Amino acid sequence: GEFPTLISLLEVIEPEVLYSGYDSTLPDTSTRLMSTLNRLGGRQVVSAVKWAKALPGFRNLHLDDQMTLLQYSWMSLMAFSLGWRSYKQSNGNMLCFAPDLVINEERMQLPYMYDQCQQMLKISSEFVRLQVSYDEYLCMKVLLLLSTVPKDGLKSQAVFDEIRMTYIKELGKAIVKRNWQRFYQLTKLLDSMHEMVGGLLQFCFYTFVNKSLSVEFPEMLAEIISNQLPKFKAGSVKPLLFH
């Protein structure tokens, strides 16, 4: 027979790019822009729950574990994909949040935008610097989902460890499909994602609690952010680093 490759499977469960429906006819405010991004983000996260579910192995975790991983890593998954789309669609020059919603120079210049957009372009330019391939990206994306765990560790740490084993192998296969040196670089990029995202989480928590700014969040994200917020205060959240 010949089981289809795990790469080929990842390729087909990769979600299709969502659409913002952003109306560039009305005037650009920064509360408006951020509230849009959050709404779009809400949708991307739903799209990412579907993806995780179709993910060979993911389902064998305890439901607590699936929660924990999706809660702890959503912002990384989203920023990673964003970085990818910006890499493809504009070669890392502009944030391509959707095809109907790109960030240009007006709207990076809007209040609050420049800082946060700088950080997300950093992610983008890594893909540029390392000429990352689609297959490399897909495996790295799975490893991102599996990169943050409670300091307590997970319930079914058993299954957890074997899942990482698989996708680390998969990452290696992908490196090949496109040479010892490469795997180092990539696991270093995975490592450096924790820092690159920490800033985004910080600003996110700010716009979430700052009542004056009237940045709206979909109930999807709000529920996650509200749950995550005491856990980051306690600092009870462990990055898995390769180095």
Partner: peptide, 11 residues
């Protein structure tokens, strides 16, 4: 527990 997320996982 994030009710919508939990929900999406249990369907």
């Amino acid at each position: 527990r994030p009710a919508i997320l939990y929900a999406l996982l249990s369907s």
